Amino acid sequence: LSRFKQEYSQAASVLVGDIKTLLMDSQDKYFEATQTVYEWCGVATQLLAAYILLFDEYNEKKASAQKDILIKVLDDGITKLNEAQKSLLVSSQSFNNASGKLL
Amino acid sequence: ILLFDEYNEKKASAQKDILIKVLDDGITKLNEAQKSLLVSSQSFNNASGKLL
Amino acid sequence: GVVEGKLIPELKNKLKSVQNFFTTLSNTVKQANKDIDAAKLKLTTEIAAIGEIKTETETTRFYVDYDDLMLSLLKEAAKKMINTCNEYQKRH
Numbered sequence: 001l002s003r004f005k006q007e008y009s010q011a012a013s014v015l016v017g018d019i020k021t022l023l024m025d026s027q028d029k030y031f032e033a034t035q036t037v038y039e040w041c042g043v044a045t046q047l048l049a050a051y052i053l054l055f056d057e058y059n060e061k062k063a064s065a066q067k068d069i070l071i072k073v074l075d076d077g078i079t080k081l082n083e084a085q086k087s088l089l090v091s092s093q094s095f096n097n098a099s100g101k102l103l
Numbered sequence: 104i105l106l107f108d109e110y111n112e113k114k115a116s117a118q119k120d121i122l123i124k125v126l127d128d129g130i131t132k133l134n135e136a137q138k139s140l141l142v143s144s145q146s147f148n149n150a151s152g153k154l155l
Numbered sequence: 156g157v158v159e160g161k162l163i164p165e166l167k168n169k170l171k172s173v174q175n176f177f178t179t180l181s182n183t184v185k186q187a188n189k190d191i192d193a194a195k196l197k198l199t200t201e202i203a204a205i206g207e208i209k210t211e212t213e214t215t216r217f218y219v220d221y222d223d224l225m226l227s228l229l230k231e232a233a234k235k236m237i238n239t240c241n242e243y244q245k246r247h
């Protein structure tokens with residue numbers, strides 16, 4: 001009955017430890033994701049703001065650029081935003097196996 | 104900022120190309136720095152568990 | 156005599172040298188956990204600090220895409236970049 005106390009200590013220990021690793025893993029991946037977003041979400045605002053400004057009255061010369069710009073910045077964040085989600089989703093999926101082993 | 108106090112018609116095309124390269128460049132360099140750092144952070148995670 | 160004389164006390168002695176080492180070790184662990192966590196902090200807080208520049212830079216770039224090398228925005232953006240950088244050197 002000492003063995004009992006032992007064997008399970010062993011298991012729980014190593015599992016509980018992996019769980020922490022996993023938790024910590026997520027945290028970093030969350031940070032990345034959010035941070036990545038906060039970065040784009042930030043340049044973006046400046047550009048949308050500019051677009052709203054420079055085209056109060058139609059600016060015929062900058063028109064073609066503004067368009068190309070709106071596209072790049074939007075297209076870009078759209079991608080970046082997507083990947084953020086997938087990164088996060090995958091982090092969520094990570095705990096699943098462990099969660100079972102726990103039970 | 105200096106050479107274009109008043110528009111410099113000749114250097115105009117270069118200045119543009121330059122602004123692009125240097126900016127484009129740092130943008131990449133800056134990005135990689137972050138990833139490098141992020142990866143370093145991730146490194147301790149396994150060990151941190153083993154510790155517990 | 157011999158038992159209660161040297162034996163039992165000897166055992167009580169190791170039980171202590173153990174309990175003694177168990178402690179120092181447990182603390183040697185608390186340290187590492189604190190050291191690791193401190194490193195991870197430094198790292199991300201740097202990551203994000205670099206982030207500040209990145210965004211400014213990335214913006215300024217787009218402004219260059221207007222073509223107007225004389226556009227106040229691109230000009231201001233370029234001035235800000237020099238500030239944002241300067242502040243990065245002082246704190247960090």
Ligand code: EMC
Nearest residue numbers: 041042044045048
């Ligand atoms: C400028 C929308 Hg995050």
Ligand code: EMC
Nearest residue numbers: 237240241242244
């Ligand atoms: C190396 C001066 Hg921002």
